[PDB]
Design a protein around this ligand. Structure first.
Ligand SMILES: [Cl-]
Ligand SMILES: [Cl-]
Lengths: 16, 16, 16, 16, 16, 16, 16, 16, 16, 16, 16, 16
């Protein structure tokens, strides 16, 4: 998997 | 803009 | 207190 | 969106 | 001074 | 409050 | 190329 | 769980 | 040992 | 090679 | 000692 | 210059 930082703004690190 | 680090505790990166 | 990076997955750090 | 980390070496955070 | 991350996009850390 | 990266040199993420 | 944070668990910023 | 930075000495973030 | 991010508030990593 | 964070001030890391 | 970010490529911190 | 992470043991980024 990969650690991806979703910038929804705000930036969260979720693993995929 | 600049990436502000808010914390309400949990810290989250966010923009302005 | 410490800064723990919690894994509810998204990683959020919070001050416990 | 997600914060991509480009590197052309120097690494820079950027969005998509 | 302060370390501020200017999101110009792309995010750079410059001290002010 | 926010996470401020002071730079008084060295850098510390003090909280304010 | 980009800086990819693999998660195969532990996380490593390998480059690709 | 929570991210843990093991001091193998190198440092690796692992999810425990 | 592990790298743990204590809080004093200012957040500093230390090897325990 | 190492990842040095250069100080041309803005902090950029690059792989020298 | 100092925390130096070596490159193997994968970037890992180690205490030298 | 370049950011250096001194291992005081705690770790502090200082500009040398
Ligand atoms: Cl994948
Ligand atoms: Cl100021």
């Amino acid at each position: 998997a990969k650690l991806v930082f979703f910038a929804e703004a705000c930036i969260i690190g979720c693993m995929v």
